[PDB]
């Protein structure tokens, strides 16, 4: 019966209120030292598109 919303996805995604899947910027942890502040604040929020089809199609049930 009922599908199953994705745990991981949910707990790491930000699908916007317009059928747009837009998550967070990836590549920040064991980094930082010899790197531009540019890189710091530009590893803030992100975007993404296309496979966000599959993301939405996976969000599901409470949608979210």
């Amino acid at each position: 019966p009922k599908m199953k919303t994705h745990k991981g996805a949910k707990k790491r995604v930000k699908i916007t209120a317009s059928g747009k899947v837009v998550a967070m910027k990836t590549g920040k942890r064991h980094l930082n030292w010899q790197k531009s502040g540019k890189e710091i604040r530009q590893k803030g929020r992100k975007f993404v598109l296309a496979k966000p089809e599959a993301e939405r199609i996976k969000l599901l049930l409470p949608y979210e």
Binding site: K10, K11, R12, T26
Partner: protein, 97 residues
């Protein structure tokens, strides 16, 4: 092979402890242009018989609307929805006395 783009990092802050979730008051907002539609009085138990709110614990007036004098009835009230209420209207807080 590659993490199915799972390479995307998490940001769901306070996504979960173990004793379930924190029992907090969830509010409920309402566009006061929807308010402009009807006229008379708007209590919690009334507006859920209508079509909004639905057992939303507390009510916060908000949104756009018109300068109509009436008895709004709720808990908290948006500061910018309190400027349409200066034009006309009554403001009741926290209910019981």
């Amino acid at each position: 092979g590659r993490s199915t783009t799972l390479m995307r990092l998490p940001k769901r802050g306070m996504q979960g402890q173990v004793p379930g979730e924190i029992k907090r008051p969830r509010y409920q907002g309402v566009n006061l242009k929807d308010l402009a539609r009807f006229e008379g009085e708007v209590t919690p138990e009334l507006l859920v018989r209508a079509g909004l709110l639905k057992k939303g614990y507390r009510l916060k007036i908000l949104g756009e609307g018109e300068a109509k004098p009436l008895k709004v009835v709720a808990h908290a009230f948006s500061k910018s929805a309190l400027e349409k209420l200066k034009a006309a209207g009554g403001e009741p807080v926290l209910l019981e006395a």
